[PDB]
Write an enzyme that holds these catalytic residues in place. Structure first.
Site, mmCIF file in Angstrom:
data_model
loop_
_atom_site.group_PDB
_atom_site.id
_atom_site.type_symbol
_atom_site.label_atom_id
_atom_site.label_comp_id
_atom_site.label_asym_id
_atom_site.label_seq_id
_atom_site.Cartn_x
_atom_site.Cartn_y
_atom_site.Cartn_z
ATOM 1 N N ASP A 34 0.847 -1.217 0.000
ATOM 2 C CA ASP A 34 0.000 0.000 0.000
ATOM 3 C C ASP A 34 0.874 1.256 0.000
ATOM 4 O OD1 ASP A 34 -2.143 1.745 0.157
ATOM 5 O OD2 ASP A 34 -2.471 1.425 2.315
ATOM 6 N N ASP A 214 -1.661 4.812 -6.214
ATOM 7 C CA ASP A 214 -1.972 4.006 -5.010
ATOM 8 C C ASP A 214 -2.027 2.522 -5.375
ATOM 9 O OD1 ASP A 214 -2.507 3.256 -2.483
ATOM 10 O OD2 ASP A 214 -4.498 4.175 -2.381
#
Ligand SMILES: CC(C)c1nc(CN(C)C(=O)N[C@H](C(=O)N[C@@H](Cc2ccccc2)C[C@H](O)[C@H](Cc2ccccc2)NC(=O)OCc2cncs2)C(C)C)cs1
Ligand SMILES: C[C@H](CCC(=O)NCCC[N+](C)(C)CCCS(=O)(=O)[O-])[C@H]1CC[C@H]2[C@@H]3[C@H](O)C[C@@H]4C[C@H](O)CC[C@]4(C)[C@H]3C[C@H](O)[C@]12C
Ligand SMILES: C[C@H](CCC(=O)NCCC[N+](C)(C)CCCS(=O)(=O)[O-])[C@H]1CC[C@H]2[C@@H]3[C@H](O)C[C@@H]4C[C@H](O)CC[C@]4(C)[C@H]3C[C@H](O)[C@]12C
Ligand SMILES: C[C@H](CCC(=O)NCCC[N+](C)(C)CCCS(=O)(=O)[O-])[C@H]1CC[C@H]2[C@@H]3[C@H](O)C[C@@H]4C[C@H](O)CC[C@]4(C)[C@H]3C[C@H](O)[C@]12C
Ligand SMILES: C[C@H](CCC(=O)NCCC[N+](C)(C)CCCS(=O)(=O)[O-])[C@H]1CC[C@H]2[C@@H]3[C@H](O)C[C@@H]4C[C@H](O)CC[C@]4(C)[C@H]3C[C@H](O)[C@]12C
Ligand SMILES: C[C@H](CCC(=O)NCCC[N+](C)(C)CCCS(=O)(=O)[O-])[C@H]1CC[C@H]2[C@@H]3[C@H](O)C[C@@H]4C[C@H](O)CC[C@]4(C)[C@H]3C[C@H](O)[C@]12C
Ligand SMILES: C[C@H](CCC(=O)NCCC[N+](C)(C)CCCS(=O)(=O)[O-])[C@H]1CC[C@H]2[C@@H]3[C@H](O)C[C@@H]4C[C@H](O)CC[C@]4(C)[C@H]3C[C@H](O)[C@]12C
Ligand SMILES: C[C@H](CCC(=O)NCCC[N+](C)(C)CCCS(=O)(=O)[O-])[C@H]1CC[C@H]2[C@@H]3[C@H](O)C[C@@H]4C[C@H](O)CC[C@]4(C)[C@H]3C[C@H](O)[C@]12C
EC number: 3.4.23.39
Length: 329
Positions: A34, A214
């Site tokens: 992440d 992301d």
């Protein structure tokens, strides 16, 4: 040396995970990698919740490099909450090892139903220190500071379902992973992987939009106003009670995202954001797009963008490098 990496495994052509270890006994965990968060967490043997029964659990007593912290932490993601306490132990990514402050999670109730439905045990943050809870130096920055790698950068070469596996490479750029030019976009935030791009979808545009690259969002997110304009007369139908849109896979009204900087142009054609769901009906696809409003108009260039474009996250040059991902090999 060469280039340290962790293999990225496609899960049902909608997510991808990598494996790393915690404890001197290298207890193995599967992670969401992440870039949009800055903490590492694993579920504890002390975890008291249904989700943990199906997971690889961390046992601090089985590690002799474990150092007790116990400071209580609540980690709040847009999609769920996990809680527990800080622990310190050896963290291994590929063949690179370092002592590290991570969250030992004992409650995952706030992470359901996604947690039990998914194969990941935890989340490995690849963001900036000042976004972290407990002021934790990012793994890649620490490895560079410890001269374990040549550069404070990492790259995402996502797996493509039934074509090739992927890699998170730590500390160097391999030219094998991308075709054409690598273009570097400077960060517009002190402590987030966020760049400025003009966003064009058919006739509608947002000038100098905030765009987050992301790895930890399994969709493209667009502003709700923007999405409403995009979908006008597009012959797509929202699922009742859910923020997801269904289309015929062959719907030629479906637009191509065009993102432009001073030195770059990135496009995302429908084949990259369509999810085939032919179990539900004949020739029907879901759009891997959701409306999401930030205080500033923002796009999340998540998984679907990074499937098409190889990405370099460079701490030292405070930029994201973008190039077309090589298809085969
Ligand atoms: C159908 C499609 C939507 C699918 N999604 C999934 C998996 N899911 C649930 C997500 O990716 N959901 C995304 C998400 O929350 N991603 C997260 C990880 C995650 C994944 C699954 C379950 C719980 C957490 C990780 C993302 O980087 C988001 C991005 C973000 C940040 C701020 C504001 C808005 C958005 N990051 C965070 O929420 O971190 C917040 C922080 C906490 N501490 C410091 S920052 C949303 C942004 C959409 C599978 S199929
Ligand atoms: C694409 C993946 C994996 C399919 C696969 O791996 N094959 C599958 C797994 C779970 C599926 C969703 C859920 O069912 C809920 C919901 C039911 C509706 O009816 C249609 C819409 C929706 C959002 C579904 C879409 C899609 O179908 C999903 C994401
Ligand atoms: C991670 C930080 C915690 C504070 C922090 O890390 N501050 C940095 C300074 C560090 N020191 C110098 C103090 C050391 C906290 C503070 C405000 C929090 C967000 C907001 O609530 C809005 C929103 C609510 C949702 O529900 C979940 C998502 C989101 C985006 C939240 C994410 C995260 O939870 C934030 C960034
Ligand atoms: C965090 C956001 C909500 C943001 C918010 O709080 N928005 C308030 C304003 C709302 N509006 C824009 C409509 C008002 C403006 C009026 S206007 O007229 O301008 O549109 C919410 C809304 C829909 C949520 C997802 C879905 O649940 C499906 C799924 C359920 C799982 O369990 C967890 C994962 C997932 C993907 C969820 C993640 C996240 O949790 C989402 C994106
Ligand atoms: C691919 C596997 C299982 C098949 C899992 C991994 C994460 C799961 C999704 C998230 O949970 C968010 C959301 C919750 C709703 O409840 C139902 C819809 C949706 C989109 C889930 C569908 C499905 O379950 C997913 C894709
Ligand atoms: C994919 C499935 C899951 C739920 C289904 C919808 C609902 O069934 C309600 C409604 C019934 C009508 O008959 C045809 C239109 C509509 C909007 C359906 C279309 C489509 O079939 C959907 C989106
Ligand atoms: C989605 C279905 C195919 C169903 C299937 O069987 N699959 C196909 C069959 C005929 C197609 C339309 C026509 O071409 C005319 C026009 C061309 C533009 O370019 C884009 C818009 C439009 C309205 C097209 C939309 C869509 O593409 C249609 C409905
Ligand atoms: C104002 C909103 C938050 C939600 C909101 O609308 N209001 C809450 C006010 C702030 N808090 C109550 C959380 C303060 C807590 C301290 S308190 O003193 O209140 O205890 C804004 C302010 C700063 C924003 C973040 C940063 O830009 C960094 C980063 C940029 C990315 O692009 C998207 C992700 C992220 C993490 C952003 C998330 C969110 O977009 C924030 C929290």
């Amino acid at each position: 040396s060469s280039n340290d990496n962790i293999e990225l495994v496609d899960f049902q052509n909608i997510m991808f995970y990598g494996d790393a270890e915690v404890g001197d006994n290298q207890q193995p965990f599967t992670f969401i990698l992440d870039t949009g968060s800055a903490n590492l967490w694993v579920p504890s043997v002390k975890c008291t919740t249904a989700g943990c029964l199906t997971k690889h659990l961390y046992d601090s007593s089985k590690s002799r490099t474990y150092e007790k912290d116990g400071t209580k932490v609540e980690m709040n993601y847009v999609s769920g909450t996990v809680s527990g306490f800080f622990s310190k132990d050896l963290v291994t990514v590929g063949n690179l090892s370092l002592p590290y402050k991570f969250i030992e999670v004992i409650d995952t109730n706030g992470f359901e139903p996604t947690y039990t439905a998914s194969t990941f045990d935890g989340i490995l943050g690849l963001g900036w220190k000042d976004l972290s809870i407990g002021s934790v130096d990012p793994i890649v920055v620490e490895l560079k500071n410890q001269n374990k790698i040549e550069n404070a950068l990492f790259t995402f070469y996502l797996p493509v379902h039934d074509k090739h596996t992927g890699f998170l490479t730590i500390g160097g750029i391999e030219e094998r992973f991308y075709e054409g030019p690598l273009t570097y976009e400077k960060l517009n935030h002190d402590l987030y992987w966020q760049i400025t791009l003009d966003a064009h979808v058919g006739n509608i545009m947002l000038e100098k939009a905030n765009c987050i690259v992301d790895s930890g969002t399994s969709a493209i997110t667009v502003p709700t106003d923007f999405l409403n304009k995009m979908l006008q007369n597009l012959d797509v139908i929202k699922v009742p009670f859910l923020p997801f849109y269904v289309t015929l896979c062959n719907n030629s009204k479906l637009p191509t995202f065009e993102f432009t900087s001073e030195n770059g142009k990135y496009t995302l054609e429908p084949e990259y954001y369509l999810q085939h769901i032919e179990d539900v009906g004949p020739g029907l696809c879901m759009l891997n797009i959701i409306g999401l409003d930030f205080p500033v108009p923002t796009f999340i260039l998540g998984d679907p963008f990074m499937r098409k474009y190889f990405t370099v996250f460079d701490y030292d040059n405070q930029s994201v490098g973008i190039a077309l991902a090589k298809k085969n090999l």
